[PDB]
Structures are given as C-alpha cells and as structure tokens.
Amino acid sequence: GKKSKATKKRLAKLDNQNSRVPAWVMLKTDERNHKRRHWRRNDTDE
Amino acid sequence: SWDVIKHPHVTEKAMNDMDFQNKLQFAVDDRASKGEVADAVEEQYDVTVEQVNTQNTMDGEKKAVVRLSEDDDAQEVASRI
Amino acid sequence: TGAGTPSQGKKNTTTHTKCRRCGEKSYHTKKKVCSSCGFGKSAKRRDYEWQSKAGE
Amino acid sequence: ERVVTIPLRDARAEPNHKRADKAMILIREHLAKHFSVDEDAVRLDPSINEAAWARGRANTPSKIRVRAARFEEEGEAIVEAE
Amino acid sequence: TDLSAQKRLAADVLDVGKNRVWFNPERQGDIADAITREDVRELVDEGAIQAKDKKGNSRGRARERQKKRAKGHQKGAGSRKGKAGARQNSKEDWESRIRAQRTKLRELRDEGTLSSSQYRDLYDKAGGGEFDSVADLERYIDA
RNA sequence: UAUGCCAGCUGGUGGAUUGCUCGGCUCAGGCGCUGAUGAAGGACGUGCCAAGCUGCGAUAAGCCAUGGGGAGCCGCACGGA
RNA sequence: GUCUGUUAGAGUUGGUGUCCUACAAUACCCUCUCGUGAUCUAUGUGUAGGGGUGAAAGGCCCAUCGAGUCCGGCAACAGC
RNA sequence: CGGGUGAGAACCCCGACGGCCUAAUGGAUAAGGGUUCCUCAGCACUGCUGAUCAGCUGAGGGUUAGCCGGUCCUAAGUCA
RNA sequence: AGGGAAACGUGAUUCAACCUGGGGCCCAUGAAAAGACGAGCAUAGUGUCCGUACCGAGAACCGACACAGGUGUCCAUGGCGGCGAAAGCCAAGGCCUGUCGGGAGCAACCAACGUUAGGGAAUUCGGCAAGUUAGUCCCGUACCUUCGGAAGAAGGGAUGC
RNA sequence: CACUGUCCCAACGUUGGGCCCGGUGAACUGUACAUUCCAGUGCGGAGUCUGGAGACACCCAGGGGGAAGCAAAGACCCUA
Ligand SMILES: [Cl-]
Ligand SMILES: [Mg+2]
Ligand SMILES: [Mg+2]
Ligand SMILES: [Mg+2]
Ligand SMILES: [Mg+2]
Ligand code: NA
Ligand code: NA
Ligand code: NA
Ligand code: NA
Ligand SMILES: [Sr+2]
Ligand SMILES: [Sr+2]
Ligand SMILES: [Sr+2]
Ligand SMILES: [Sr+2]
Ligand SMILES: [Sr+2]
Ligand SMILES: [Sr+2]
Ligand SMILES: [Sr+2]
Ligand SMILES: [Sr+2]
Ligand SMILES: [Sr+2]
Ligand SMILES: [Sr+2]
Ligand SMILES: [Sr+2]
Ligand SMILES: [Sr+2]
Ligand SMILES: [Sr+2]
Ligand SMILES: [Sr+2]
Ligand SMILES: [Sr+2]
Ligand SMILES: [Sr+2]
Ligand SMILES: [Sr+2]
Ligand SMILES: [Sr+2]
Ligand SMILES: [Sr+2]
Ligand SMILES: [Sr+2]
Ligand SMILES: [Sr+2]
Ligand SMILES: [Sr+2]
Ligand SMILES: [Sr+2]
Ligand SMILES: [Sr+2]
C-alpha cells in the first residue's frame, strides 16, 4: 500500500507510543505499558 | 511561528556524508521545503548550500541532507556546534 | 467455495478509515462518510436517542 | 590400532529410505563395543561417513573395513575408512 | 560463531548465488570478525572466502543423438510421440513447397526458357497443387 | 505391607472472611448557556531522562500583571542528574 | 457457445476414501468436468432490508436469510 | 560425519557428504500489514521439543528522485 | 565510459519483445479527456510538494494461530525430453522451517501402497473399489443420421538399436 | 466381450503411525458409591433393591458387549 504524509505521522506516533515504561518511572512509583502493541498480533486503525 | 532547523542529525551515516561528501544532516520541520532548508542553513552557519535532499521519517519529523559547496568544510561547521 | 475461512482470504479492501472529524476509524473512504459522527453526510453531529436506554 | 570389518546387515531392520543413518549408528556401536569404550568416545572420520552414504540414503555397503585407534586419558577411539 | 551476515555480504561482493560462497572452515574466527563489505573483500583476496563454480548441463549425449537424427535415425514409429501434423505443420510445409515452385518458375522466365503465357499456365497449375515438388515440376515442364 | 480410604497436623495453592475506603448511588440547595473575535470535539506535538494520565500549544506540565501566600519548589510519580 | 488436453485458469461425478476435540466452523488425496466463450479473472463502480440481486435452488446480500446486522421499543407476552 | 561459539548444542554457524523446489520452495511487485527491515546485547515471554537462534526482548540505526509512482486527464459513476 | 582474472569472437538457424502488412466476422461495432506533434537553434536559470525500509506468504496479508485454506500481476524462450507452457530428470537461484526427537526385523490393529496360484463378478442394491485399454503410423470400420455426424466405431498389423 | 484379490480365501511385503524412551502437553466427561454375574423385584428395560453365585490388590496392551455410553431442553407426534 501507499501511505499519505498524514498516515505516516500517525503510524510514526503509534511506533514511538509502543515503548517500555522508563526504568526510572518504576522506581519513582515504587513498582507495564498497557498499550504495548505487536505488528502481527494486534491491528492499528486505518 | 515555527523555525526551520530543529537540530543536527548525528548518526554514523550522517558522519560519513559529512566526512566523505561534505553533507550535513538536520532534523527539520516537516513544513519546510528544500529551498527553505537551504536558506535557513546558509543563514545559521554562514555556508553555501549546493543541494538538499529531504525525507519524511518514521519518527514523525523531516530529515534533510544538506550538501555544502567545496568552498566550505562540513566537518568544520559540524564541529563548532 | 465455503463462505467461511475460504472467503476471508479475499478480504484486503480498505473501507473504514480514521475520520478527520471525530478521530474514529469509521470514515468509509469509498463512501466518504463517517458511520460514527456522520462526517461528510451531516453538518450536525451523528446522535440518536436509541444509543441509550429510553429513560436515560 | 586395528583394522576391523563391520557388517551392516542389521541396518535392514530400519525403514529402507534411511539405511544410511542407521549404518552410521551401527558402525559407532560396533567400534565402541569391540574397543571397550563409550559410543560418545568414538570419532568417525568423515571418510567413513561418505562411504556409507556413497549411493544415497536408501543404501549402504553390506560391510565396511575401518582402521581404528584407541588411546588418551579418557579412553576413546578414532576411526577412518581404508 | 554465526556467519550468516557475512555469507549474504560475500554473495553480493563475489556476486554469485548465496549457495555458492565457500568460507574456509579454519577461518571462521576471522570471517566472524568481518563487519563491512571491505572486510569481506579483503578476506576474498586472501582466499578465505571463495565462490564455487556454477554447473552447466552436458549436451554431449544430446549432440550424439542430434547427429543420428539429422542422419535420419532414431525417428522410427516407436520414437514418435506427436501426431504427424504436429511433427510437421502441413500449411507450413505447403508455404515451403509452393514458394520453391514459384521461385523456380520465376527464374525460368527471366532466363528466357519460358514465355510469359507458359509461365502463367504453369504458375496457376502450381497454385492449384499440380506439382508435388520442384523436381516434379521440372519433369512436367520437360513435356 | 504396596496401590489406597477417612480425619488431623506442617507447608502450599486459592482469595472467601473480618477490618479499612481515594469510588459509587440517591436526595437537597445554588447556579446555568457556548460558537465565524472559529466553539464543543478530535489529531499531532510539547518534559533533561517521558510510555500512560493530566496540563499546555512552536512562548507548548508553561509566559505577564494585581492581590493573596510563603521557605520552600520543579504534576500524578516515593528515581537519578 | 467443435473435439483432446492437470498449459494457464474455472469447476467438482464417484471414493459415501482421509479428516470429523481437524491443518481447516466446509480442509487433503485420487478419479472426474470445463478450458475461444452465454468463458475465466483483477480493480473500480452501482443496486439495501418487505427492499435489492436471482439462467429460479427460497439461491445470495460479510461463518447470519421463507425477510441481513446493530442498537432501541424492552424488564414484550405465555394459561408452558 | 567432522568442527565453530557457548555455562549448556539433534535442530545457531562453517565444511564435506546426502537430498528437496523448476509457473515454483526461484526473481520482481499490487493490495493489505506497519517497522516486521539493519546492527549490537540478550533468552523471563513468543516458537508444536531444545536453543547460544529468531518475524521474540532491550538499545540504537535505516527509506535521499526535474526524468519511478503520486501529482495532471477523463471512465462507469460520486459528491457539493 | 564502464565491467572483466583473462579472452575481451565471427558467422548461421529458429526467432519472445518491438515494428509493419494482408485476410475473415458482427441482429455484437469494440472509451473519453488532458496532452503531444504541426512549430528552429544557443546559453543560463528553475524544476517545489508526497510515496520510497521490509514481507508479499505451508511464519510479516484475511481466516482468533508462526492455520495443509484463501489471496491480484509479470518473469510462458534455461538444458535433455516430447506435439507440448505435459511427465520424468537436471541447471541458474532457493532450501533441509510443509521444524520435536530417540529405540524395538519394529507384535496386534489402522492409514496409504506393492505382489498374489487356480477360478474369474460367484462379491454387491449396483463391478462400489481396483483393474483392463493407452502414445504414433499403416490397413480397416456396422446400425443409424438432421448428411454435419456416428468414428479413435469395432477389428488387425507395426514400433528399439 | 475384455480384465481383475469384488469374491472363493486369504498370504507375504512397503511407507507412516501404533509399542518402549527424553521433552512438550490439552480436551470430552464427573450426584454419590462402585470387583461383578445369573435370576427376581421395581414406574413393566437394575453395577447400587432381594436371593444366590463369584470376587486377593494393582498395572500394561486390545477390540468396543453394557453403563437404555458421550454429544444437541426431540427437528417426528400432540398440546399452546
Ligand atoms: Cl500478406
Ligand atoms: Mg521525496
Ligand atoms: Mg490444411
Ligand atoms: Mg509453520
Ligand atoms: Mg448374493
Ligand atoms: Na496487523
Ligand atoms: Na451553573
Ligand atoms: Na527444529
Ligand atoms: Na525445449
Ligand atoms: Sr493474523
Ligand atoms: Sr527511530
Ligand atoms: Sr456455485
Ligand atoms: Sr480482494
Ligand atoms: Sr453528503
Ligand atoms: Sr438526530
Ligand atoms: Sr470448446
Ligand atoms: Sr455421495
Ligand atoms: Sr482410492
Ligand atoms: Sr467434513
Ligand atoms: Sr476438454
Ligand atoms: Sr431489549
Ligand atoms: Sr535458560
Ligand atoms: Sr531478520
Ligand atoms: Sr519471421
Ligand atoms: Sr524496494
Ligand atoms: Sr498459499
Ligand atoms: Sr542448484
Ligand atoms: Sr522449533
Ligand atoms: Sr517379485
Ligand atoms: Sr455381477
Ligand atoms: Sr449376482
Ligand atoms: Sr490396436
Ligand atoms: Sr482403544
């Protein structure tokens, strides 16, 4: 498929959004990314 | 009002284009055209832009590969910043 | 040819997409109409009283 | 150091399309026995390998002469075609 | 050690099918340390990395058969698998023959051997399939 | 006496129970319009490190003034710098 | 709207074979039928629910059809 | 069958021998997917067994066009 | 220029692509528009914006799965073979991932197969299942018929090196 | 007509399972009790009641006689 500039920004965001919760946030909160996604098992919008 | 250049794009590949081809790489605002990137650069570092290549990255921002004239030395420019 | 699995393999058409107006993936790019907010069909926002119980 | 003639007649008990592998087992098990060592201690020089697979997997010579040597501090044999 | 990456790079530098690059069994360590295409070429030069030759089917046996058949052998009833019209296209064969007859008649006319109307008479006869071949035509011409 | 039955003991598994309440549910009083000066909503950005939430909008968890407040502070969030 | 044909491709007579907590909520194998035409096929496009579409089997309209699906009427009514 | 790496090797890698695929098990692409691509470091999770491997985990990096598409034109048809 | 370790060919045949003609068919007639040519040459300047990774499948798509299903295009001219884009075998290229292994002459039983004396459909609702026949050439070919067909009727002979 | 393991009547063999071992590792089903058998009885179709008979426990493999086996609040029939 072909992606428009906007569709790319969105996919781009969904990629960055798919990260680990910073090691330090777990300390600061004295002990999970509930939105963690997988390209194969999940399905993004559009 | 948005500024054109956001920050230099320093990565192994960027370093080469700099060493071997007198090209500098920047992260630019995705609303900037090659022409607006060229002018922006010449004014920020006082150098002459021969060519510009842009790419809309998967990071959400635009990357620009600015080649300087043989009159300027990319490495030198990059070094002061 | 079965209507089940065999016929699912033919599905690679894109219809519903992210809607510029409400953000839901309901903008039918062939109809150019958001089945969610009704963008492209109604200037008003798509509402319906049946979307909730009658006394609520 | 000794030259032994190994019969591979018992490889016929295994399905025909894979007699080669079985043959290689039989060889190892024969040396390990006749030289009083562990099968894990038996090293088959690739030359033996090629002899058994020479006509593909479904076959194998019915016998094979191998030259074996025994030694070291763990007690193991090294063998090869002839 | 895992040399998969290098195998891929070497297949591109030696420019051959990946399945033809050979890595010296006693130099994995060095090949393992190869990171860049330059490292690979260097190793190619040393000979630690090489390309096996591609194969080409032998046509020797085919050639022998090709001769026997050109000589008219090995084409008996027991060797034919296709219908006669398939072994030789009839319309094609006719194009072959009739052109050879018309040419013949053309040379015999500019050569003065045949008058215009004699040529015409034979030409139309030819076009009507009166002659089995050029030789058959000449036989006829000799009254 | 093996395999085993019934009950208990020690330890698990499990999360009932008791205790606790940052959330609900209901009632009462007050108050009550927004938008082309582009709303409501949404998208995408925005932090030294930042994924979520909240906030904010290229001046981007903020800028200015007046008053209050006060030795502490840099949101949820007890980390490091 | 010819013939043979596992050319591509379309289909499916029989085995009532294999499978039947399957590889698969319609699959596998062999046999079989079509294969220049009322042919097959991709994408785009149109027709919408008492309405479509149907060389007509009450066939098909997203595993759903003698009246799709979703939510609402709704906590339908029943002597069972 | 040897060997490499490794705390650990039937299934990660090298070589030899032995095989499998030929309208495809090879080459290039549409749709669709969306980072699955490359590198390093890993093996609690995912993987019909194992794993040092990986489409898995962690961290970085990667897509450069006057002349390839889009963009322009109009098709069935669609909307304002 | 480039490429090659090196040589760094010349002729021929058959000829995909591509080019250009001739014929036949229709109760069927096989798009439109932008654009281009028509309409020279120099030199210079400008040519922005968007897509560009990878998979494209017995593990990257849809089917809840790393699903034996489904899923469009082109590579249709690689060699032998033969009528052949058929079988079978083999290159170029790819792979050992249609991803658990180790043992027992490895029993009974099951799946999918091979071979079975004499008899030869007696089996069965039914020859179901299996088998028989088979490519090509020559000879030869009945009833019936809408004169097209039936017809590869049937039947017989040949086949290598 | 031809041919043949369809049959008389079965045999031997091949490949993959089956069996043993490492590893991985479900589901169906479960009121309880339960080593049964022959009779009888009982809502007239009993492992469980009565009378006898038999019965040392546990495990492996098997083909499925019974549990009116398991699966789906019978679709036939009547009733509303
Ligand atoms: Cl012509
Ligand atoms: Mg671009
Ligand atoms: Mg003719
Ligand atoms: Mg698989
Ligand atoms: Mg009978
Ligand atoms: Na997906
Ligand atoms: Na108010
Ligand atoms: Na494996
Ligand atoms: Na050929
Ligand atoms: Sr999927
Ligand atoms: Sr990145
Ligand atoms: Sr049909
Ligand atoms: Sr489709
Ligand atoms: Sr509208
Ligand atoms: Sr309304
Ligand atoms: Sr036809
Ligand atoms: Sr049937
Ligand atoms: Sr069969
Ligand atoms: Sr079935
Ligand atoms: Sr046909
Ligand atoms: Sr309701
Ligand atoms: Sr481990
Ligand atoms: Sr990879
Ligand atoms: Sr020609
Ligand atoms: Sr590409
Ligand atoms: Sr497939
Ligand atoms: Sr090959
Ligand atoms: Sr595996
Ligand atoms: Sr025999
Ligand atoms: Sr009969
Ligand atoms: Sr009979
Ligand atoms: Sr004959
Ligand atoms: Sr059983």
mmCIF file of C-alpha atoms in Angstrom, chain E residues 18-92:
data_model
loop_
_atom_site.group_PDB
_atom_site.id
_atom_site.type_symbol
_atom_site.label_atom_id
_atom_site.label_comp_id
_atom_site.label_asym_id
_atom_site.label_seq_id
_atom_site.Cartn_x
_atom_site.Cartn_y
_atom_site.Cartn_z
ATOM 1 C CA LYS E 18 24.435 -17.256 -1.746
ATOM 2 C CA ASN E 19 24.598 -21.042 -2.035
ATOM 3 C CA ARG E 20 27.929 -20.864 -3.835
ATOM 4 C CA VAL E 21 30.057 -18.940 -1.390
ATOM 5 C CA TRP E 22 32.625 -21.041 0.453
ATOM 6 C CA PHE E 23 34.034 -19.991 3.823
ATOM 7 C CA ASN E 24 37.278 -21.624 4.915
ATOM 8 C CA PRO E 25 36.460 -23.960 7.870
ATOM 9 C CA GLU E 26 39.647 -22.828 9.609
ATOM 10 C CA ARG E 27 38.952 -19.116 9.373
ATOM 11 C CA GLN E 28 35.510 -18.650 10.887
ATOM 12 C CA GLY E 29 37.011 -16.546 13.650
ATOM 13 C CA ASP E 30 38.396 -14.069 11.149
ATOM 14 C CA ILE E 31 35.320 -14.212 8.958
ATOM 15 C CA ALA E 32 33.282 -13.788 12.140
ATOM 16 C CA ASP E 33 35.111 -10.536 12.850
ATOM 17 C CA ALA E 34 34.376 -9.275 9.334
ATOM 18 C CA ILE E 35 31.882 -6.434 9.694
ATOM 19 C CA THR E 36 31.969 -4.450 6.473
ATOM 20 C CA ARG E 37 31.993 -5.291 2.778
ATOM 21 C CA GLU E 38 35.597 -4.092 2.811
ATOM 22 C CA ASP E 39 36.442 -6.701 5.435
ATOM 23 C CA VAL E 40 34.865 -9.317 3.195
ATOM 24 C CA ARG E 41 36.724 -8.293 0.015
ATOM 25 C CA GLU E 42 39.941 -8.343 1.969
ATOM 26 C CA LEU E 43 39.113 -11.895 3.035
ATOM 27 C CA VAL E 44 38.132 -12.708 -0.545
ATOM 28 C CA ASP E 45 41.603 -11.591 -1.641
ATOM 29 C CA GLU E 46 43.268 -13.793 0.947
ATOM 30 C CA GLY E 47 41.158 -16.654 -0.383
ATOM 31 C CA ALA E 48 39.414 -17.374 2.938
ATOM 32 C CA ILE E 49 36.195 -16.672 1.047
ATOM 33 C CA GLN E 50 35.563 -18.141 -2.405
ATOM 34 C CA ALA E 51 32.824 -18.865 -4.902
ATOM 35 C CA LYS E 52 32.298 -22.416 -6.138
ATOM 36 C CA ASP E 53 31.573 -22.798 -9.853
ATOM 37 C CA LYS E 54 28.079 -22.935 -11.281
ATOM 38 C CA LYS E 55 27.126 -26.110 -13.141
ATOM 39 C CA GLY E 56 26.166 -26.424 -16.773
ATOM 40 C CA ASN E 57 24.372 -29.482 -18.127
ATOM 41 C CA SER E 58 26.332 -31.625 -20.572
ATOM 42 C CA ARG E 59 24.994 -31.570 -24.102
ATOM 43 C CA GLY E 60 27.434 -34.216 -25.309
ATOM 44 C CA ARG E 61 24.892 -37.036 -25.184
ATOM 45 C CA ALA E 62 22.248 -34.807 -26.754
ATOM 46 C CA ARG E 63 24.705 -33.944 -29.529
ATOM 47 C CA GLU E 64 25.267 -37.587 -30.393
ATOM 48 C CA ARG E 65 21.503 -38.075 -30.575
ATOM 49 C CA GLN E 66 21.185 -34.872 -32.620
ATOM 50 C CA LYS E 67 23.511 -36.355 -35.254
ATOM 51 C CA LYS E 68 21.806 -39.752 -35.504
ATOM 52 C CA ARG E 69 18.547 -37.913 -36.123
ATOM 53 C CA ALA E 70 19.986 -35.432 -38.606
ATOM 54 C CA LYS E 71 21.202 -38.523 -40.457
ATOM 55 C CA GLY E 72 17.632 -39.793 -40.320
ATOM 56 C CA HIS E 73 17.938 -42.282 -37.466
ATOM 57 C CA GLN E 74 16.074 -42.781 -34.187
ATOM 58 C CA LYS E 75 12.795 -41.493 -35.632
ATOM 59 C CA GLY E 76 11.014 -44.760 -36.284
ATOM 60 C CA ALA E 77 7.369 -45.328 -35.384
ATOM 61 C CA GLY E 78 8.476 -46.307 -31.898
ATOM 62 C CA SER E 79 10.101 -42.926 -31.264
ATOM 63 C CA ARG E 80 7.313 -40.628 -32.450
ATOM 64 C CA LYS E 81 5.129 -39.206 -29.729
ATOM 65 C CA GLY E 82 3.321 -36.454 -31.631
ATOM 66 C CA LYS E 83 0.634 -36.705 -34.301
ATOM 67 C CA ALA E 84 2.068 -36.410 -37.853
ATOM 68 C CA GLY E 85 0.626 -32.943 -38.407
ATOM 69 C CA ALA E 86 2.371 -31.873 -35.224
ATOM 70 C CA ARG E 87 5.785 -33.231 -36.271
ATOM 71 C CA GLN E 88 5.477 -31.220 -39.497
ATOM 72 C CA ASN E 89 2.970 -28.401 -39.919
ATOM 73 C CA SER E 90 1.210 -29.013 -43.227
ATOM 74 C CA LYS E 91 0.335 -25.380 -44.048
ATOM 75 C CA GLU E 92 3.913 -24.515 -43.194
#
